[PDB]
């Protein structure tokens, strides 16, 4: 049991009372909150040649003093706030495993009581990483994390529930022991570079003070940590051949500045069952697994050396460069909004539609969208279908993930008390970089053109890092940041910083950091070039819409109250509300009895408005 | 960019600026109704020993009433009339792959805008001709599609949702180069033969129309053809090596009239046991899918041999000759309507469920436009367990096929369905055995139980499936002979050409759908089988009269009640009770469902007689 | 076919008409009801080396699978599966479709008698016919198989399934705090009824000719080879259980560690044995081992005697803001149980799958048991409720359903998580939620306990009788793998609230389930004095931060801008805050809050919108 102080707030840390047969298990309260979290690591190796891992954060309607409400079967799916909280526990650990630990784990938060005061998902990061560290699951070091909101000026470090409310920023630090940082996710009002900047340093500094008090319960413990059968990665002798083979060959590959996607894969896969075959003679005895692995560290290597020693990328571009940038908006008539973006090879199509303000709360059946609320009304809708990769696939967590980042980036600039709510689909035609941030500026596009009055553009960009780093230290002797990266470059890469923003502030952030962490003072320069990078976008932008449209399309929708006589009430409303429901399957009019006397009507189209108004008036003969 | 006109419609084509990284895509419009299809084919074998090809029509609901239903409410799942039109969009494309394409295959079908005038579904057939031409994925010939409506006695080619509202037919046809016909999909108010076969070769026409626009993009693009490493077919020295060691055992399996479905697959199979193995020595060499595949095109060549040579089939039957058919009706007491029809060794057992029309809408404004209000208040629920094949089968349910086919006998009963009926009429149709169209079983059955429970629907319906064996010269492709059988078995459809489904009344045809197995049939085929199955459905139509002819006069006396009861205004708040608390336990423990109708009289309806009593005590216990 | 007079019932079974593909088919009818069981078994050997046995009891009338469906599944699973041959892996299927239902005479009984009906006319191979039937008692009388009225005033209701020679298959009870000689006696009344339904099933089965295959193989290990593997690991498996210091783990891979060395001796000296048949011939040796000691000695394998309980240590009011909470530990079988409280009319609105359905509870009580894959210390999806977990949690429901008080003011929901699993996780479900409902406030009339019973039987293979048993109190897991029975009961003091007996022997004695009925009560005692040092009586009142209900009056013309069009404003407020606002007449509104200061905040709605 150790006690954490973090400025007016107490983490208390425990262990060794509750699941006691998990591979490792903690319980963490601040306040009357409680969170407890187990990890699971087999000791089989998995059949499949990657890290299995698996975040499983279980929200419940107990502990919180809510039976599930009407419906049969009391817990259906998973809700959209449980997916993000299990996406960023992931991130948060993720990074610090060994290289190879090729062995399913599993890491499951179960919510044991909630006071409504001191949120959880932040207790649910930090249990995770006390599970860990006191299990002897093999794991690098403690991670502390805070959540950061800014209230009147004031940096507030793990809000309560009210101070959400009232806060301009809602950022969650994941550090790493000496300061390193994991995992970044923000979501702020709009807010200035510099007090983004500061807040981060303020976090950082209180993952420190997390960091020290689990260091403390794991020495009074006593972990100790199992010796896996084998770690998957190839022997340096392998690889060290596999670099003699094919070092000119993919060196050539990644300097041929007229390769596309498609091509430069192909080119990279050529050499790939070339080498592949000459390997096995030299050694025989090898793993199937290993040969491939060798050529992915190798083709790794290579394109790592370029950037480094040249400073120019595979596409020929700089270090700060753009790829072509290219919209279009009002495609299709009947759209209410309408755009179409291109970065590079990325093509994503954004679509705007209004409903209803009643659509905009669900309830009942499911969990997925059980008390579905919006704060503005407005939603975007990510899609990332599979012929955007010329895949075959089943039509997750993926999808879910960066339709929260895209809607979080517009989400500072859609105005209040709109008529309708608002409804953002991006469709990813094409993927070869951020489509997610791609989503924001089409988003962006779409938005203006269908005439929501938005109080700025929203442009987002990703930003790429490639380091050198020696094994007999660990540190990071330099390194090269990239701007709007390319799908391989984020793949042989170390982190994908997404952030979005209008040109006079950030609103989101989201750092995937693959490293065991990075230092501040790179994390301080991803968000300066990527500041410069998303004026670019912003200019390009412009020139295909500037403002939005001075009113909505005319095949918009249109809300109408008719009025319907207490006689003829019976008639129009029919047998507990018969007619009414028929009337909105068949046409797509939503009737709302606003009072016994008056129906508000809304009608996504004037047609449907037509089309239901002679409903109405046959009904009152 | 190719623009074609078809009458007053105007259809635009496009590629070459959407998705540049599938390895097909189309854009297809018409009015302001755009479509985006895309294909994609792995290069790697599969590991399955078919062809792995999904379609998926995709749908962000705005023809579907505009209403959004996106992912705001995509995690319950997809939609039955996605489904369907799945099936149609799958149906049109599978018979032009070539054959021993054992390679992943997924046609994905995107809405990009719906004006709520244009159909975007047979959009969506001619986008995925269009994405599959320009792509290298090995196809044999363009596909066109359109549908054709009747109005006012006249012929209307891709009618809009106003005038599909008033058509009474809704036939969809998917042609292939030299007017061959790959697929039919009918559902018809009992049209004549003649008006119905007419507007098949009005379609066949509209579809070469679109054949050369598709063959002019095709022409102005550059379009080559990948090599596919290689193609899954027997060797033709195996093949014939087959025929010698299996031919005479497999014409005698053929040719033993006393066979039933299990026998004389068991008979077969003991002769597949016998030839693999031999085979295995002679050719080690060859792959374990190849000695199979090759006894299954001896198998297959054989079985239509004796069709072709001697008009004779496998069960003894003439090419005309209908199965034995048996119905039942009143099989149990507490049923509102019951049937058990059996034709050969098909049973099938067809239920009639009255329920309250409130049932019919889920209270909730998306989900319910997500499937419907069907437009009388009947709906059929088809199930194929997997006993019915003695065979082991998952528990879920409603997989494609048994919604398809559910949908199918559905709109074949529905013509005659009456208007105005004060219920809910749920037709359940069970499948027990199954030897051959259950499906269409399910439409006689289905209008027996009718017909006991005491709907007055207009007329019987009777279905029957046709199928067909042709002799096809290798290289010219064309069709020298054929043989169209009537009430096929399951071999005949497995070993056959096509499986035509079609149902209708004694006057006219409701329902038809063709599942053709070859790359296009002629016209002057589709034509004879349509005639050929006239003759059958009124030999079916006279022995399910002898069971039952005319509508019970009545339903049956266990059945459900409607009435009306008053409540004092006073009196509401402590018989709704607090938040309805009173209403919705009064159902669970009864049944019964209670309506605010009026400010002062709820109306109840009750499964049973017996339920409205306990309904009507609580109603007059909280009375004093 | 051939009927079956069961007192003033009469039961109807038939075959050889529908679904005739099926390699068995049975329709079962008593009055208007009839129930359709198919049963389906592969030829070929199923890869999965065990007995792939699936029960799927369906209702065809849409209006996924109800609660209902599952747990009728598993009644049916349990009577028909001890009765398999050893070693028949082999895919099966059993298929209960409801062709009318009268609502008078229940179906699921008939369901139990049609699937032994299938499965004896079937070529499968299975052991003789299963009669089943319910027992209530309805004003002090016994009534076999009661219809739906008479159900609803029975004080029990138990379903007894039997084998031949009165043995007992399947025991499946709950009642209403009945006495142990009430209950006792009505499984004598129970098992003398299914001789009479068996005797019906054997006219049938003679008059039909029932021919059964023969499988390909019968996956069994060769007697050889098992007597070579009791000379390799008999002394080292006896070392390891004589061993009282071993927990669940440490016990594991101790048998583990022989285990590895095993197989490769094995190997050696038999190379053409299939690799499962040395995995399987090891799980004999051990459970040969593993019962040899209790038989013998009268110890089990961590010490204690037949008649020794675990170590149980009770908690409440772990949390302050749960209205109540407790930790029952029971040996290494950890459980975590919490009381919520919501509206009366907390889960009524719109889309039940089929209706009087909806969510409405008989005394606005349930409870739900969830097993997480950590208290195994495994992997697995966590999102859905399997049937395992829905069949517990309606065990302990039914276990505390008796003691818990009509007209409550709140809808009580029950949820236990197994954080530690080494037994009986259901039964410690049952006194875990009675002491968090004592904590929580609400006057249960008394404390529930529940336990299972195993069982060690030595039967000569001559014949097959049992010659003399070992029943054990408060059982390991270890014990019900290598057991007999899973006897889970609980009950209050002075009574018995719930039964399920998980027999995997082909029938056992009446006398043996009476034994364990009278050992289970004595344990249920000690357990009882446990529980009430902790906590002996229900709290005077609710947690002071517990839900609470206010009415407020809006006038007719506010009525209006409250509510919202349509009713938004309530369905908002019910969004953010989780308050509800339920119309109770024309002017008064009432406002329920999970918590106090939610409601103070709600309040400022109201007063917000004045």
Redesign the interface.
């Known amino acids: 049991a150790v006690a954490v102080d973090l400025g007016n707030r107490k983490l208390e840390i425990s262990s060794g009372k ?6 490792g ?1 903690a319980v963490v309260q601040s306040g ?3 969170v407890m979290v ?1 990890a ?1 690591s ?1 000791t089989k190796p998995s059949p499949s040649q990657f890290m299995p891992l ?1 975040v ?1 954060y ?1 929200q ?19 809700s959209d706030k449980e997916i993000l909280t299990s996406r960023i526990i992931d991130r948060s650990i993720r990074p610090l495993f060994p290289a190879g630990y090729f062995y ?3 890491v ?1 938060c ?1 919510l ?5 005061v001191n949120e959880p998902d932040v207790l649910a990061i930090n249990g995770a990483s006390v599970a860990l560290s006191l299990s002897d699951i093999p794991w690098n070091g403690p991670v502390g994390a805070v959540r950061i909101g800014i209230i009147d000026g004031e940096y507030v470090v793990n809000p309560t529930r009210k101070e959400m409310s009232s806060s301009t920023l809602n950022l969650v630090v994941a550090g790493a022991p000496k300061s390193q940082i994991v995992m970044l996710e923000a979501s702020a009002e709009n807010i200035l570079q510099q007090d983004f900047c500061h807040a981060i340093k303020v976090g950082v500094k209180y993952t420190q003070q997390i960091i020290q008090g689990i260091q403390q319960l794991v020495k009074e413990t006593g972990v100790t940590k199992r010796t896996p059968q084998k770690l998957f990665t190839p022997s340096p002798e392998i690889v060290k051949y596999t670099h003699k083979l094919a070092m000119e060959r993919l060196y050539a590959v990644f300097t041929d500045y007229e390769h596309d ?2 091509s430069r894969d192909e080119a990279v896969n050529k050499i790939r069952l070339d080498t592949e075959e000459q390997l096995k003679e030299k050694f025989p005895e090898a793993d199937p697994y290993e040969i491939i692995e060798s050529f992915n560290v190798v083709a790794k290597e290579v394109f790592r050396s370029i950037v480094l020693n040249e400073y120019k990328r595979c596409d020929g571009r700089d270090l700060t460069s753009l790829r072509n940038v290219s919209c279009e908006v009002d495609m ?4 209410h909004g309408s755009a179409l973006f291109q970065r590079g ?1 990325t ?1 994503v ?1 954004c679509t705007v ?1 209004f ?1 209803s ?3 905009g ?6 969990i ?2 059980i ?3 919006k704060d503005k009304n407005f ?1 975007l ?3 990332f ?9 089943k ?1 997750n967590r993926r999808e879910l993930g960066h ?1 929260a980042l895209a809607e979080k980036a517009l989400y500072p600039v859609i105005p209040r008390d709109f008529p309708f709510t608002i ?1 953002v ?1 991006s ?1 990813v ?3 070869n970089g951020s489509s997610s941030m791609a989503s924001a500026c089409g988003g962006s596009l779409a938005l203006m053109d269908s005439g929501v009055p938005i109080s700025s553009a929203v442009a987002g960009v990703a930003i790429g890092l490639v380091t050198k780093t020696d094994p007999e230290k660990g540190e990071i002797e330099d390194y090269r940041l990239l701007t709007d990266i390319l799908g391989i470059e984020d793949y042989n890469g170390d982190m994908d910083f997404k952030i979005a923003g209008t040109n006079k502030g950030i609103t989101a952030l989201q750092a995937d950091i693959k490293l065991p962490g990075i230092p501040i003072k790179i994390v301080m320069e991803a968000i300066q070039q990527a500041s410069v990078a998303k004026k670019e976008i912003l200019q390009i932008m412009n020139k295909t819409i500037s403002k939005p449209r001075a009113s909505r399309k005319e095949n918009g929708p249109v809300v109408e109250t008719v009025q319907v006589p207490l006689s003829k009430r ?1 008639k129009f409303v ?5 007619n009414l ?2 009337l ?5 009019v ?1 009737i ?5 006397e008056t129906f ?1 009507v809304f009608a ?2 004037p ?2 408005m037509h089309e239901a108004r002679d409903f109405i008036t046959e009904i009152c003969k």
């Open positions: 509750l699941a006691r047969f998990a591979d298990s009357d909150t409680a187990t699971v087999k698996v499983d279980r419940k309607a107990a502990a919180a003093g809510r039976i599930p409400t009407n419906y049969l079967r009391r817990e259906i799916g998973t399913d784990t599993q499951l179960n044991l009581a909630v006071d409504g996607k498609v299709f008539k009947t759209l090879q093509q199509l539609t409903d303000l009643e659509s709360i669900k309830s009942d059946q499911v997925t969208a008390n579905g609320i939603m809708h990510y899609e279908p599979p012929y955007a990769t010329n895949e075959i696939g039509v339709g409804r689909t469709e035609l094409e993927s019976a029919g047998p507990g509300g018969y429901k028929k909105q399957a068949e046409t797509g939503t709302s009895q606003v009072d016994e508000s996504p189209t047609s449907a």
